[PDB]
Amino acid sequence: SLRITRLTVFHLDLPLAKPFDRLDSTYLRIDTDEGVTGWGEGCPWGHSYLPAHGPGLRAGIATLAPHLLGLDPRSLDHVNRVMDLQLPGHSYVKSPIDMACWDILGQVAGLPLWQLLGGEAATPVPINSSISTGTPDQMLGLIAEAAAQGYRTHSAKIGGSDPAQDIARIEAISAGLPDGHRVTFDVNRAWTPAIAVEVLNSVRARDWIEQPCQTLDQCAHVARRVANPIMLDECLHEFSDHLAAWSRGACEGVKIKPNRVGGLTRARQIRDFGVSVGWQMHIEDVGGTALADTAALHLAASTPEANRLASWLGHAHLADDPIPGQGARNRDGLATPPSAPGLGVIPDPEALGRPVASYDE
Amino acid sequence: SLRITRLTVFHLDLPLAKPYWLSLKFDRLDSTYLRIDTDEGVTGWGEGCPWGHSYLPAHGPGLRAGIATLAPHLLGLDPRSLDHVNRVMDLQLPGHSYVKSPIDMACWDILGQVAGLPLWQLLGGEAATPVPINSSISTGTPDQMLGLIAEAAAQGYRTHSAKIGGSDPAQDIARIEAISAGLPDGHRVTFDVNRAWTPAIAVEVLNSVRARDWIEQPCQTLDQCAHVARRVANPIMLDECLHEFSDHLAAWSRGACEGVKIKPNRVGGLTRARQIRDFGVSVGWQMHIEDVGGTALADTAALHLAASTPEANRLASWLGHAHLADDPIPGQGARNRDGLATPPSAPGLGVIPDPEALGRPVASYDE
Amino acid sequence: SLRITRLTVFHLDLPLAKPFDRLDSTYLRIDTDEGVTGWGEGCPWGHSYLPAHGPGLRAGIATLAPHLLGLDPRSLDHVNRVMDLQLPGHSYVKSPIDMACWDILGQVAGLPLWQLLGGEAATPVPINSSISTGTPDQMLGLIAEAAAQGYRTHSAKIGGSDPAQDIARIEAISAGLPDGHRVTFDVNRAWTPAIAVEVLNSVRARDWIEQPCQTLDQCAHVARRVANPIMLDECLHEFSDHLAAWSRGACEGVKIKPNRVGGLTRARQIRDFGVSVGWQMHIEDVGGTALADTAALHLAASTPEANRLASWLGHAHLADDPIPGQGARNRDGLATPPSAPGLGVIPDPEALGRPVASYDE
Amino acid sequence: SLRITRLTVFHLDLPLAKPYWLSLKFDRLDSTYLRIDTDEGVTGWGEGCPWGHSYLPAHGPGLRAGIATLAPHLLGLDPRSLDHVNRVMDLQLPGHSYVKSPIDMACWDILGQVAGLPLWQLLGGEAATPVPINSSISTGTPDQMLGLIAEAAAQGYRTHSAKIGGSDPAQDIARIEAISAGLPDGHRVTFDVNRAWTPAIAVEVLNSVRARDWIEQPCQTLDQCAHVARRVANPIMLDECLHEFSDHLAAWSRGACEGVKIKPNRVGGLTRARQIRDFGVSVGWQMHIEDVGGTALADTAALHLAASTPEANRLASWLGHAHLADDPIPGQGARNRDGLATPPSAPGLGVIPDPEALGRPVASYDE
Ligand SMILES: [Mg+2]
């Protein structure tokens, strides 16, 4: 008999700290007849990073609202089935909805998400830096910085059509890393296979390379020809892409991002599959405020230590904060998810602005 | 030199001829017409009309949101450079093929008018080939569907798409054997299952039946359909699981099918549909080329691609406007004349909607 | 109603600048009833390089002429279908015909080929040198030269039955290349797999190796055993060979040459396929005058920058020029295709000689 | 020591017995006879006769152009060293197998005469084995083809090649079941489709029919035929897609077929045909060995290879000269005597054309 009673949609205009200069984030409030309210966030990283954009996100909540009204939000797999029937794909639309129902379930259950996701403890999860693309000594300065801030894993954005510079970047960074630190070379689909093969086979570094090419097939091809661990990310849209990645032997790890795979319920199924096949995983969201970071972090904290790599906190990159003082935050390069029932963050609607849409029955 | 100058968006509420009931009255289609103007006064039109919002990853409100996201980026582009415009849309909004298809269709219109050639010719066709049209035969008993087909046949249809599916093998079996046995001579049927089978039910029914007609998309995924294909004897047609060119390449390398349907709104437009068409010809696929839904505008776009396809590879097209109660573009576009439809031969697309017939625009974008 | 009205065949005797000492080129003029004339060129690189030769080329135009007369040249796929029905294979015969119809279509459309082939602009395409086979310091002198001329990519012809010399060649050239320049080792089918494996696994260079062996199967075998990017060329005769190359995971790039694949319509289908699977490509013709170079260059200029490598200009190697002042030419290591409608080159028949054959209806 | 001294080219205009009409009257064959002389007065002859110019990558004018290109390079060669001559032709003009086949055939003639042995013996055969010949049964109704076969049978044919194909499954089905059911006892048929099916139509027809006779080349490519083969129950014979030895190796490794036809003009001559023949024996293929077209000269060359093939692997040969209206070499070569033909036992090829019967030479090449 618990029923979803109202969905309210907020649009947050979030300038980035280091300027696209802004993010378009959607906050979603879900009410129930018994007065338990859940919240979710979907904030695509602009509209060019993934099949996702803020105005489409809000349009998708509109298409789904009338099918979500009156569902029992405690039945998470059922909620997801209904979302899949009513609007295929659009994982970016589905994530904040699924996030908010999880929040409800955790509040009704009296348990934080990390415990519903199976974890023994609110594990402090190591956080990782983003090193933006530049020259060999530039990136190396940005790393010295991040290390001073307490990051011990760093994700260097590299890529291009120019084999020589990526070679230079990789060999400088891989050698001039502080002792005990970890670096991932994030190419974000910017190589063709020819470049990946030339670059990686010219370099002694055997660090992680993340998503070197645009497709799974192109990544698998690179993997058979080079010696580095390959991490997949943006080409994984649904569970079947992960199964294909596994069956092609394409990778040794994946990133799992709720807004890319359709929320916590889908992410958890992927996470369990990754543990079963020995993958190591970065579990984080695509972008947004500490609300999105918190949901991801509950899933990251509940992952076996052998399989869990550092998480990125998207809110580190924002000029503003709509939910100051809430969520997993960086404390000496570690973020601990909250232990209160549900998500553990409650946005104040006054901080958010006036709702851009609202659906009742 | 030529430059996109304005994009105008129209939302058309299209009633269906035959509502059907759902477990919801599915009543009407939400169609988007897009008008692209340029600085030299050549204007192109395109349509994107998802079959409601549950058929594919596509819905009307999402389509109009996508155009909003892309508009700032299309303003200023030379619409004659089609591949380039496609790359921009791909850089600026990955996926969302249902968003991209009307934009690409309008650029093709513009290109055709600048070239003074009909789309079927730019697509390589020797002539405005009349293309056979198929019937839609709704699910029911063996005796019903067979009566719905005699009826179809009296209207000039020689190819028929029989909608079967559901989790009771026994009546799917009865339907297939009945329909396949009692077709008029020279007629053809395809059994459209529409992802309704699990692989277990597919294997049980197809291996229970003597009929060797096409089975279209028995299961939800490519991987499931390829599994069924290795275990049954019928020609397999893929459709809904094919979202982009790499899925076609994957279908081909697994030997999953002997044909595909190509629908611009599913694959992102004519430029992308054409590359797939040509791939199909290279590997010997037979293909239905048609759109997902909409008025005779989306249907004419698809029919240009269908008419330019070599006869060996070309099967019947479905005309979505045949299922509509209204017509916003009366007397324009390829229409069914006794089981065949012929694309226009005017430069470009060959249809020009009257803004007066469309309602007030819901969005406009200019530089 | 536009109809092909006459085909005229010219035979050009072209001495090479650096001496087989000559090329046999065929120029083809196609007239229509509405007075729009298109031109094409097929010029095999002698008769030993590919399944192609000048006298066969002219013989094939003879077999096809009566099937081409009266076709609508604007319908390019239809023209190609008719050529395939009437004379299977013989891509070398078909290329100049298809080239001339494209020229017509571009003139009727009022658009240059690079825009009909989808490009945003007449992109200046980087040109690459040909370094003929010799000793390590010889080839290195020839490269210093080409670099002075403005070439920044160089194609070194290597190959033989002698592993030690190719090792010497490769390691000298790969190390003594000017900064920022690119080198491809063009073996032109001159290795068996045993030699390819010994050579490439003895060398630190990870430059492109082009067509190391006689067949696709032999190249794929080498590719699985070595660390360099493999570029395919001469074994690709038709689209199905490219599909097989892709499915075998044999290569990371291909060269596309109109006279080898049957013209611009076939080349474009290959080019689009290469972009879709992440290949990088050299798009150029097999040999001939700036007319053949120009057609290829329209297709090269319209290829996404991520996928496009340098083009070779065959006319650089000729003593003569029948079309002086026309076509894409080298200007500081870059060639820009023309922007006039169609091909953008108009041969003067007076410069060509007396037609060796002519077909009317 | 022995040296090629002159090459002489003849062009023979061969009328067919049965013109057939095209959508063009296909009237006559363009055949090339080549004479190779040497310094010791041993002369060899070869023939290359494509089945018109649309059947394979081959045509008469191209063949005479190819000989022109190769002549300077063959002049001076020792024609006894066959592999070597093949390598030279391969270095000097890649591909163009239709060009190389008559040159290689003439060298084999020369080699046989120098050795004082018939080709069938140099090819390893124990004796001049009479080889069964098959009929050609033209496309028509079930009742026609079956009447064309009783007729064939009365002429001594026990193997019949029934030409089917076209994009209407229903009558291909009727033809196959009719013909396969009503063969004389002891007789055999092959259904020659000649690349006319797409894979969808192949799968529909073959999986609709009880007949398990050979199907020859259902589809255009090896990859399409191998796809069909995995899904149907009939023995598959490959032919036209096999251009060179690597395609045979590819056919073998995909399990695409249980037999092949070997035609010298398609694969480049006897030297290349022989290597493929032997490969077929090693892997247990059954094979038809015959030429593409031409006079009893090309037919005798192929029949030497056919007679030397072990009986387990050897099926019927087609004799191209049976379809000609003329005969430039009357009373020479292997001819059909009541369903069998026997290659000659004279040294070399065993046929010697009279230049007087051939017209004036169209080209001559000497050192
Ligand atoms: Mg990434």
Ligand SMILES: [Mg+2]
């Ligand atoms: Mg379907």
Ligand SMILES: [Mg+2]
């Ligand atoms: Mg090469």
Ligand SMILES: [Mg+2]
């Ligand atoms: Mg055959």
